[PDB]
């Protein structure tokens, strides 16, 4: 399991840049194949943990699927929260899968933490 996830880094196809108060912290969370990246309050479940009281246990999730003989990457986000997740300032519909584009900004309803999605 560990070796397999290691080798998916062998550049990650995308990553989240963690942004606090408008500025990058320098932390990145890679988005690699065959992993679900969860953001929320629950450390057992989440790869990135936010403690703001409005944040859900699992607030939003990120993953990718490579289609057509591993040639066309699609990157997804899904809101799982009570109070909402914003994509470029726009409220996602809860439990609906949304396709991400390079430089999209994800804000969890909560200065504030934003996640900047970057394709590599």
From Swiss-Prot:
Disulfide bonds: none
Parts forming coiled coils: none
Family named by the database record: Belongs to the protein kinase superfamily. CAMK Ser/Thr protein kinase family. CHEK2 subfamily.
Name the record gives this protein: Meiosis-specific serine/threonine-protein kinase MEK1
Residues covered by the FHA domain: 37-92
Domain of life according to the entry: Eukaryota
Function in brief: Probable protein kinase required for meiotic recombination.
């Amino acid at each position: 399991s560990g070796e397999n996830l290691y080798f998916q880094h062998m550049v990650a196809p995308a990553h989240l840049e963690v942004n606090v108060g408008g500025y990058n912290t320098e932390q990145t969370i890679p988005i690699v194949k065959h992993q679900l990246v969860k953001v929320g309050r629950n450390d057992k479940e989440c790869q990135l943990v936010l403690t703001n009281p409005s944040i859900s246990s699992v607030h939003c999730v990120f993953w990718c699927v490579f289609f057509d003989e591993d040639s066309i990457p699609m990157f997804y986000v899904k809101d799982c929260s009570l109070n909402g997740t914003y994509l470029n300032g726009l409220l996602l519909k809860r439990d609906k899968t949304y396709l991400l584009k390079h430089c999209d900004v994800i804000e969890l309803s909560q200065k504030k933490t934003r996640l900047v999605f970057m394709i590599n």
